[PDB]
Structure 1
Amino acid sequence: GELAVCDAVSGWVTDRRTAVDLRGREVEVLGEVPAAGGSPLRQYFFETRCKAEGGPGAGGGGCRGVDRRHWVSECKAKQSYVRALTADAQGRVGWRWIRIDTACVCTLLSRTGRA
């Protein structure tokens, strides 16, 4: 009988056309890896994101269970690096470490103990 503080969604991502690398730059992500032999290997990932441009004023969407009286919170996605065949800004193709989303975590923005 437990519950998530941030609602996440997990699945196959076949539409990731770009990603940020180890160095913080943006690289393009190829759809297929030329594997030695007959058919090319397909490049796709498995990622976890947040289930979270909304009416003005409104907002105030924090994490479930955080003391709204002490904290301003927000569910944000977390990254992990995976190796992927990609192309950089100048065209060089190659294997680089890229950030994909592997979780939806709660972030505390400001305040504390009834300040």
Structure 2
Amino acid sequence: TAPASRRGELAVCDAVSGWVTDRRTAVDLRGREVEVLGEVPAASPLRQYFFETRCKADAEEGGPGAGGGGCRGVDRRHWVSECKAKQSYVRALTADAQGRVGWRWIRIDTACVCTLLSRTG
């Protein structure tokens, strides 16, 4: 391990990115549950998958910078923080409850962010 100092800019919250090839359902920009088709239009087929980013998963409370606990670098004298997933929209070939197919804006995890709650004096 190399000292946090010998490396560069640190994240207040640790994240993990990776491809998601098995998301079968999502929530669109209207709050409705939708089915995510396995294949998207052509540019032959082409499997539809996504690039998602979540907070580093972590059961033994305590350590700073872990999803579900405090964030790294926050002033505990005045704030209570928590690392949370942040979602955004990406357009996806989907099917609604009526089965109608079409591109729709669905939410996915694209980042892990820090949130605050004052406690100051």
Same fold? TM cut 0.5 = yes
Local SS of the residue matching 2:81: strand
TM-score by length of 1: 0.80
Deviations 1:29-67 (A, max 9, x none): 11112538xx3111001111110x999999982111111
Report the more deviating stretch, 67-76 or 53-62.
53-62
Aligned partner of 1:96 among 100, 104, 115? 104
Deviations 1:41-99 (A, max 9, x none): 11001111110x99999998211111122212111111221110111122212110111
C-alpha RMSD over aligned residues: 3.7
- From the superposition, tell whether residues 16 and 65 of structure 1 become closer, same or farther in structure 2 (CA, over 3 Å): same
TM-score by length of 2: 0.76
Q: How many residues align?
A: 110
For structure 2, list consecutive stretches of 5 or more residues without a partner in the other structure. 1-7
Shift of 1:9: 0.5
- From the superposition, tell whether residues 84 and 15 of structure 1 become closer, same or farther in structure 2 (CA, over 3 Å): same
- From the superposition, tell whether residues 26 and 76 of structure 1 become closer, same or farther in structure 2 (CA, over 3 Å): same
| Identity across matched positions, percent | 100
- From the superposition, tell whether residues 60 and 110 of structure 1 become closer, same or farther in structure 2 (CA, over 3 Å): farther
- From the superposition, tell whether residues 46 and 111 of structure 1 become closer, same or farther in structure 2 (CA, over 3 Å): same
- From the superposition, tell whether residues 81 and 60 of structure 1 become closer, same or farther in structure 2 (CA, over 3 Å): closer
C-alpha contact 2:14 2:66 (8 A) present in aligned 1: no
Compare the two structures and name the one with the higher strand fraction. Answer: 1
Specify the alignment match of 1:80 in structure 2. Answer: 88
C-alpha contact 2:78 2:120 (8 A) present in aligned 1: yes
**CA distance in 1: counterparts of 2:65 and 2:17, whole angstroms:** 30
Shift of 1:112: 3.2
